[PDB]
């Protein structure tokens, strides 16, 4: 295929010493892939949240370019 790599450009909103369980991480990843990308190339803007707390912002880019897309993180607080 053309796209061979997925990139995540991130920055921290708040320090959070907690860690999501694998069950939570799996649910987060499945949701975006299935309902957001839907098996196609694209760009998603996201925020990792710990309850009501905004913790991390990540721009996820899936494009034909295997090269680091750079740019700035984007969010969905």
């Amino acid at each position: 295929g053309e796209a061979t790599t997925i990139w995540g450009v991130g920055a921290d909103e708040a320090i959070d010493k907690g860690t999501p369980s694998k069950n939570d991480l799996q649910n987060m990843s499945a949701d975006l892939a299935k309902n957001g990308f839907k098996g196609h190339q694209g760009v998603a803007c996201s925020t990792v949240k710990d309850g009501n707390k905004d913790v991390y912002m990540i721009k996820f880019s899936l494009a034909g370019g295997s090269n680091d897309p750079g740019g700035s993180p984007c969010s969905d607080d």
């Binding site: 061979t4 790599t5 997925i6 921290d12 939570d24 991480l25 975006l32």
Partner: protein, 63 residues
């Protein structure tokens, strides 16, 4: 824990390489979608150090 997201750019381009260990968790049954989910998972795990200690960066995963 949750991931709030929105598509900034949506396409119908399906040209995506296959991978090893396509995800079968969360109702996924492998395939390209599973390749993408396994990619996102690795990136989120990588970023735990950055919400724990601060900082940003660009992380990648084969898909």
């Amino acid at each position: 824990w949750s991931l709030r997201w929105r598509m900034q750019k949506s396409t119908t381009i399906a040209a995506i390489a296959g991978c090893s260990g396509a995800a079968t968790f969360g109702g996924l049954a492998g395939g390209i979608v599973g390749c993408i989910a396994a990619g996102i998972l690795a990136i989120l795990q990588g970023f735990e150090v950055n919400w724990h200690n601060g900082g940003g960066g660009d992380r990648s995963n084969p898909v």
